DNA sequence: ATGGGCGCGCCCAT
DNA sequence: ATGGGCGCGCCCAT
């Protein structure tokens, strides 16, 4: 029956760098670990002008400065 | 060059339905198109009694009350 | 500080 | 209404 059926768990994305092994389930996930290998930090606060990798940790950040 | 790669689009997450030719690029996107051939509508409304396949839909119907 | 994992709920067309 | 797409932001270990 597809009552009982569960969608399997999956990792379709793999780390483009030949040398690491790590795939991941949804696309936005790999893209945030890529930024591991790559050292970017997109996101930057206007205010300290910080740079980070992620966007949650730098909302994070934001909210403390008042 | 690393640094300039973006993750590929893509969808993985293929529906099991054999006369179904869907395919998401994330699993809770298929989990909620399962329930379209299943009918089922898991969350209900306890003001109400009414029933929604999908939670973002009961959230936003929840507020019509107030 | 920052990363893996992923849920809640928005956008927007139906 | 209700479906596909997908981002913000939280949890919790780093
Ligand atoms: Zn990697
Ligand atoms: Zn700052
Ligand atoms: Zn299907
Ligand atoms: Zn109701």
């Given at each position: 029956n597809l009552l009982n059926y569960?969608?399997?768990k999956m990792?379709?994305?793999?780390?483009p760098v030949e040398s690491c092994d790590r795939?991941?389930?949804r696309s936005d996930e790999?893209?945030?670990?890529?930024?591991?290998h790559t050292g970017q930090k997109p996101f930057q606060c206007?205010?300290?002008?910080?740079?980070?990798?992620?966007s949650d940790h730098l909302?994070?950040?934001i909210r403390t400065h008042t």
């Open positions: 569960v969608v399997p990792r379709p994305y793999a780390c795939r991941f389930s790999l893209t945030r670990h890529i930024r591991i206007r205010i300290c002008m910080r740079n980070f990798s992620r909302t994070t950040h």
